[PDB]
Amino acid sequence: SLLEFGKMILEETGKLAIPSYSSYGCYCGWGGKGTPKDATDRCCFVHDCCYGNLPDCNPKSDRYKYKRVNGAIVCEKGTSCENRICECDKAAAICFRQNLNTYSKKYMLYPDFLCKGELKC
Numbered sequence: 609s610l611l612e613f614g615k616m617i618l619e620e621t622g623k624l625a626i627p628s629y630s631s632y633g634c635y636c637g638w639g640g641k642g643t644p645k646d647a648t649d650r651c652c653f654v655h656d657c658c659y660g661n662l663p664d665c666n667p668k669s670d671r672y673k674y675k676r677v678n679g680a681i682v683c684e685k686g687t688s689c690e691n692r693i694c695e696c697d698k699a700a701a702i703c704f705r706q707n708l709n710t711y712s713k714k715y716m717l718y719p720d721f722l723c724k725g726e727l728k729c
């Protein structure tokens with residue numbers, strides 16, 4: 609679910625999902641178009657694609673369970689949708705952690721019309 613994703617993001621990065629990742633760049637948050645702005649935005653592009661791979665799941669609202677083993681996120685076994693949603697979220701949260709070094713506050717609330725370019729999943 610979106611709230612669990614937000615908690616996983618905070619756990620990983622130490623940033624609050626809202627506002628750090630809810631409206632960032634072209635892809636983080638509602639909607640997506642154009643060329644991602646940076647590596648963090650690319651995390652969101654791929655997360656969007658990952659949710660797009662699950663047209664008959666409901667990633668915003670379906671809750672999954674996970675634990676940590678030696679630090680690392682381990683998605684626990686729920687329904688097939690829940691497992692797949694968890695893997696998408698885990699990847700994006702790790703990706704955000706990996707790209708905190710280039711995160712730029714200039715991309716928060718980035719305006720949609722500047723999202724020029726084209727990117728297929």
Ligand SMILES: O=C(O)/C=C/c1ccc(O)cc1
Nearest residue numbers: 625629630636637652655656
């Ligand atoms: O917290 C939210 O409401 C959603 C954040 C979000 C993070 C990555 C995305 O690819 C799309 C939305």
